[PDB]
Design a binder for this molecule. Structure first.
Ligand code: HEM
Ligand SMILES: Oc1ccc(Br)cc1
Length: 137
């Protein structure tokens, strides 16, 4: 289930974080514009950049902590507010997050592992709800 999936992802955080982030950019290539240092670089070049691995991992660490603090896939409003108030997210809208979760769930369904994809979809939907309540446009 969802709790085991958090354990699976955490066990190999950096690899899942890179693979899912690249799945997101590959599905929605226009989103790369938010990451000006990743524009024009192959996946192997990205992997050679310290900040690529560091910041994928940090994104997914925070995502796992928000997931683990949720009850039945309903995140804390305080966690949604963290995400809204981060200066790094100041020009995003909930659609950016929706696309991220669509890509994440698609990756899970294509992986051939027994992720609880329906729960990640629902968690994403509930997180998007919470981001808009916390003021994201
Ligand atoms: C629930 C999903 C997300 C979580 C948990 C999250 C978390 C984070 C965290 C922890 C950082 C800081 C990383 C660091 O400084 O090392 C970060 C930075 C950033 N995030 Fe998010 N983020 C999420 C979704 C998104 C989405 C959808 C976008 C844009 C499409 C985005 C764009 C950015 C950008 C541009 C930065 C700063 C650039 C960078 O660190 O490379 N984030 N995010
Ligand atoms: O550097 C970053 C990698 C992945 C997301 Br999503 C945000 C920032």
């Amino acid at each position: 289930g969802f709790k085991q999936d958090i354990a699976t992802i955490r066990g190999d955080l950096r690899t899942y974080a890179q693979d899912i982030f690249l799945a997101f950019l590959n599905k929605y290539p226009d989103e790369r514009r938010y990451f000006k240092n990743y524009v024009g670089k192959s996946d192997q070049e990205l992997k050679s950049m310290a900040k690529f691995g560091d910041h994928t991992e940090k994104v997914f660490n925070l995502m796992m902590e928000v997931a683990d603090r949720a009850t039945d896939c309903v995140p804390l409003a305080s966690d949604a507010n963290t995400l809204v108030q981060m200066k790094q997210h100041s020009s995003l809208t909930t659609g950016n997050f929706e696309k991220f979760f669509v890509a994440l769930v698609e990756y899970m369904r294509a992986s051939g592992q027994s992720f609880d994809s329906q729960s990640w979809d629902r968690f994403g939907k509930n997180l998007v709800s919470a981001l808009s309540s916390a003021g994201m446009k």
